[PDB]
Enzyme design. Structure first.
Site, mmCIF file in Angstrom:
data_model
loop_
_atom_site.group_PDB
_atom_site.id
_atom_site.type_symbol
_atom_site.label_atom_id
_atom_site.label_comp_id
_atom_site.label_asym_id
_atom_site.label_seq_id
_atom_site.Cartn_x
_atom_site.Cartn_y
_atom_site.Cartn_z
ATOM 1 C CE1 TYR A 33 -26.243 -22.386 -10.788
ATOM 2 C CE2 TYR A 33 -25.303 -22.100 -12.959
ATOM 3 C CZ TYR A 33 -26.365 -22.437 -12.164
ATOM 4 O OH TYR A 33 -27.581 -22.782 -12.682
ATOM 5 C CG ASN B 175 -35.557 -28.198 -9.143
ATOM 6 O OD1 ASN B 175 -35.364 -27.860 -10.322
ATOM 7 N ND2 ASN B 175 -36.071 -27.405 -8.207
ATOM 8 C CE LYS C 294 -26.397 -26.348 -10.725
ATOM 9 N NZ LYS C 294 -27.784 -26.844 -10.557
ATOM 10 C CG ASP D 175 -29.650 -25.518 4.536
ATOM 11 O OD1 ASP D 175 -29.208 -25.447 3.339
ATOM 12 O OD2 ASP D 175 -29.001 -25.177 5.566
ATOM 13 C CB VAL D 176 -30.124 -28.707 -0.630
ATOM 14 C CG1 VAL D 176 -31.554 -29.128 -0.943
ATOM 15 C CG2 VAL D 176 -29.781 -27.354 -1.271
ATOM 16 C CB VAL E 61 -35.861 -21.331 -17.342
ATOM 17 C CG1 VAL E 61 -37.324 -21.707 -17.293
ATOM 18 C CG2 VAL E 61 -35.046 -22.544 -17.760
#
Lengths: 662, 662
Positions: free
Chosen positions: A176, A105, A180, A78-79, A208
């Site tokens: 977000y 990532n 980023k 869990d980052v 993507v």
């Protein structure tokens, strides 16, 4: 391709977070095919196990020997949890005895709410998972890489995090976008300190092509997800705007909410003792149906109704409302007299499919290469970039040539506005939030009181001592218009208390309470991951917490201040201030666009107390006093009530979401 | 396994210019080892044959078959011979049946002179070799690539061409800097039109470790080359500065030149006949010797003396000098009474070594990765980048993490100077150079005459008709202060003529004479290389030609204007305008730095008539008129005498080398 790159990364060891799926899973696969040893880590055990098994099968068929030992996994990573990340570093070293590449990532989508609707816990989770995690891993691996003489750290950012010198608004996604932008800003400001041994770069793909984007199993694709949120936010904003417009005209908020509680468009459209705004709202809602969905018969779901009353509460619109002033926040979903039935959709699926095709076309039309890159295309690019040994401090853009045209660029200030514009401040109230920046707080309070004739400057501080230091810098006559409020719980509580005590502010200036630390990667005393998390709290989350209230205030302008650096300092504080300037600009740009969609229409602009070039920082007292004066001029320029937006399309744009350096 | 990376380029066909040596040769070698087919082109057959033979040998070794046909060469291909470039395209098609990659690698160092000393032929040679050659090859290969559905064009630019939104000064290399900035600017503004089939990117290495930088034979290394040119320019500037300062005090130019012609430091030092400026210059030169070199005994070589008199002539300082007025330009190197002996060096070998160590140390200290990248490191990075399929419109930075800190970003204008500063224009003369931009030229003439009380605006035009059109827009009272001068030979002669007739200008505004073409890569009617060359002449060389005279005028401010786009136009003119804006900013930044080293200290700033975002271009008449008025306010901001560097270090920096968009 996949069987003929065995030489590219032979023997290199990589730790990849979020390595179970999407770009991460493809990067793990291609590094292994390229001769690399991979520790793939993720939350989901089953996805990770299946992914690693497919990689090992391919390594057999291209005739690697010893394929099981080449690709290893660690699940339940869990980052958002430091202890869990430390386990990934320990597992990599136990398996392979070193780390060459760290691929940051892992990422979450985040709150997917407007700033005024977003919880602090959701915001914190996004910043912890997407940004603080990256610094946590850098802290632990960078010394290992420096000691061995080489390494590569790669942050997987997003096109939506912007690019150097050019911020981008990402409405509904401010948490977000900040996370980023922060991953990229780390590369821009910290690569100097990770050199000479460690390369530190980012990648910034846009959308993507793969299972997550398309949607798999039962799951809506991402454009269909975005489209459904666009419509929910549209209905919330419309109901909210009608409620505010009625309250401004002097309808009681309890009368508005009693009329919305009936939650019946037909009956609201034509019933003559509904205020004009609610009749107009109900007529408009009644035209949006498809014959299956219910949003044409009901104004609100419980979830939209809860978000509506939270917005009214946070604007202080319940202070004089007998029932609503004391109702428990826990009951914000429960006040509708009827609710849409559960056997039918609220939203029309045709309007959702049309919002999704507009999102999809909006991206596709901006790609130089005409088609969205696949996950494999981005992973291929990543594995090629990881082989280069001459690049550091850059963001690669494997986006398909994604080009979103905008002019939201960092400006150095040299200019001013009319005395008639400043004279509109006469008799008004302003809030200054700060602690350590005493000369800047003092000169701004002075400019508002002495030059603009404001009646009251509410100085919201962490300590009484912080108030006293600013007051001591003002002439006794100016000081009689300075009011102290010391934070007792959180800044939102202090803003609620200021609004309750002294009324609606015309200008809110937000400055950080704490100075930046003077350290980063130094072996003797490095910036620990807990200290970095505090830097994020004090310099990004702080401004979010002020913004989420200030954006609900009619006729108010919001001004956000990025950090200063003490004159003569030669530490990494300057790097940290530029990291914050970039990352906060993502917030400012996004919030300026969201606020124009809200009925309150609050402008937000950013002022930067650190310049881009350290040799251009003020170097003596004259230059320091010049900067302190320029700072207060910049606050008046974006803080004073703005001239007409109908005046000029060009000028209208300059005063929303700017980042101005003094 | 060790070295198989064929999956990267198997079967891909590359044309590489300058493919026999340096980075180009290493790209050819590494593309071939990665399974690619290469056409290496360059001037010398002997060098091509060595490079090809070494590659073919290594291919045989690592185990390729049919290796002869994979690596081919064509000699006598020179980027200053466009016919020879077309032959390289034909040769690639005959050998391989197609072209996948165009590597625009070949280039020249250029004139290595300050702009005020640089000839137009030397400038044109650099821009044709380094920039127009790349467009020539793009023009021929793009249609081939589009027809086969894929391709890659890679421009080999330089760190010293700058980066997106951030120009860099490269003093004594303005021709080179502009050419390198143009290579990048084509990527930024034209990638949209090469897509969707063709990827279009650049690389921007800084200094690269190899034979060329180190030096071989007896050929000085680059840093040693740069160091000697720094000393020669330092001597020219110091002699020039002393001459100008004596002339400003009222010493006759005749008298200054007669004293300099004696060319004897010890005599000039002590003689009372000599003006104080020449005594101080002689004393300073006498202290610079090493006991071998002669620059401590002689002020000047013939070459430096020729450059000195050319600077004085071009400033109009011979207009009232009987001898020098009429002296033929041919004899500019013949007027010294004594010249340094041929058997001994003029410059001291030790101070060259010290300037070379200083240049080299400067670069090294700015590398995040601590080591200059080798030719091999840059070629390897290039070969990895060429394998990516998702990037277009970007500049890769395989530089060793080179980071030159500067604050030269394009800024959108909002602000003003005090009426007091505009009032220093009263009674002065302004020059406006232009033809097609009638509305802008008219408002600017009106602003200077009516708002600033300039006595005279000299409108220097290509035709009488262009003058008449501007004059027609002005009130009869304002028009009384407008003077016509129609170009009869070249712009430099029109400037000499305007100076001779009406005296020294305070402000010179340079606008292009011709509108941009409305085409680029369209199959029906592309922009031909010859038309692209005329775009460069009209929009870059034109400003160079104005600048090389303006930069020699005491108390004058220079303002360069980049192109407009007609309202409602939807052509590639908008892309061409942004290409020029970026490329001209390299010139503006470099010239601003050079001019501060000159005694005349002429400020230079750039104003842009096209925005970065096409949707933000003026849409109607009101927006057109607003932009016309804003342009004239921008010209006044950078055109009126600037306030002292001593007044504010920060303000002084803003007003030098800026790029401001209206």
């Amino acid at each position: 391709f996949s069987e003929n790159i065995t030489g590219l990364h032979l023997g290199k060891v990589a730790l990849i977070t979020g390595g179970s799926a999407g770009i991460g899973g493809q990067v793990a696969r291609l590094l292994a095919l390229a001769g690399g040893k991979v520790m793939m880590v993720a939350r989901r055990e089953s996805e990770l196990a299946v992914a690693r098994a497919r990689i090992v099968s391919e390594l057999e068929d291209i005739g690697f020997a010893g394929v099981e030992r080449r690709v290893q996994t660690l699940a339940n990573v869990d980052v958002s949890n430091f202890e869990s990340l430390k386990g990934a570093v320990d597992a990599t070293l136990k398996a392979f005895g070193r780390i060459d590449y760290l691929i940051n990532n892992a990422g979450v989508a985040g709150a997917e709410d407007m700033v005024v609707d977003m919880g602090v816990d959701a915001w914190d989770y996004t910043l912890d998972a997407n940004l603080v995690s990256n610094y946590f891993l850098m802290h632990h691996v960078a010394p290992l890489m420096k000691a061995q003489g080489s390494g590569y750290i790669l942050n997987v950012s997003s096109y939506f995090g912007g690019e150097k010198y050019l911020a981008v608004a990402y409405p509904n996604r401010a948490d977000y976008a900040v996370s980023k932008a922060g991953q990229r800003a780390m590369v821009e400001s910290m690569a100097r300190y990770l050199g000479p041994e460690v390369q530190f770069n980012a990648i910034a793909p846009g959308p993507v092509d793969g299972d997550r984007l398309s949607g798999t199993g039962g799951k809506p694709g991402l454009f269909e997800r975005r489209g459904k949120l666009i419509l929910e936010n549209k209905r919330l904003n419309a109901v909210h705007a009608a409620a505010i417009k009625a309250i401004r005209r002097g309808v009681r908020v309890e009368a508005v909410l009693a009329r919305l509680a009936r939650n019946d468009t037909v009956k609201m459209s034509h019933d003559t003792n509904n205020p004009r705004e609610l009749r107009e709202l109900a007529l408009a809602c009644a035209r949006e149906g498809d014959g299956t969905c219910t949003w044409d018969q009901y104004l609100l779901t419980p979830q939209i109704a809860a978000a509506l009353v939270s917005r009214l509460r946070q604007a202080g619109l319940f202070l004089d409302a007998p029932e609503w002033s004391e109702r428990p926040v826990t009951e914000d979903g429960d006040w509708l007299l009827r609710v849409p039935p559960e056997d039918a959709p609220f939203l029309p699926a045709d309007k959702i499919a049309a919002e999704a095709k507009k999102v999809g076309g909006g991206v596709l039309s901006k790609l130089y290469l005409g088609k969205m890159p696949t996950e494999h295309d981005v992973a291929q690019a990543t594995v090629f970039f990881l082989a280069d040994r001459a690049v550091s401090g850059e963001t690669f853009m494997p986006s398909g040539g994604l080009s979103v045209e905008r002019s939201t660029t960092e400006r150095e200030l040299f200019g001013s506005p009319k005395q008639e514009r400043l004279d509109q401040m006469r008799g008004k109230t302003v809030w200054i939030i700060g602690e350590h920046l005493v000369d800047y707080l003092a000169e701004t309070a002075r400019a508002f009181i002495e030059d603009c004739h404001a009646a009251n400057v509410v100085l919201i501080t962490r300590t009484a001592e912080g108030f006293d230091a600013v007051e001591a810098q003002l002439d006794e006559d100016v000081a009689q218009s300075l009011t102290s409020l010391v934070v007792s719980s959180d800044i939102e509580a202090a803003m609620d208390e200021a609004l309750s005590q002294w009324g609606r502010p015309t200008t809110i200036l937000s400055t950080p309470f704490t100075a930046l630390p003077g350290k980063l990667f130094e072996a003797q005393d490095p910036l620990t991951p807990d200290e970095f998390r505090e830097v994020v709290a004090d310099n990004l989350t702080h401004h979010f917490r002020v913004s989420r209230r200030a954006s609900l205030y009619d006729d108010c302008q919001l001004v956000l201040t990025s950090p200063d650096v003490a004159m003569g300092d030669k530490s990494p504080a300057f790097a940290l201030a530029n990291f914050i300037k970039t990352t906060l600009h993502a917030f400012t740009a996004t919030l300026a666009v969201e606020n124009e969609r809200l009925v309150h229409d609050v402008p937000v602009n950013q002022i930067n107390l650190t310049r881009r070039v350290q040799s251009e920082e003020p170097r003596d007292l004259d230059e320091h006093l010049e900067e302190v004066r320029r700072f207060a001029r910049a606050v008046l320029l974006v803080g004073a009530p703005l001239p007409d937006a109908e005046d000029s399309r060009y000028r209208a744009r300059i005063y929303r979401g700017m980042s101005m350096t003094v």
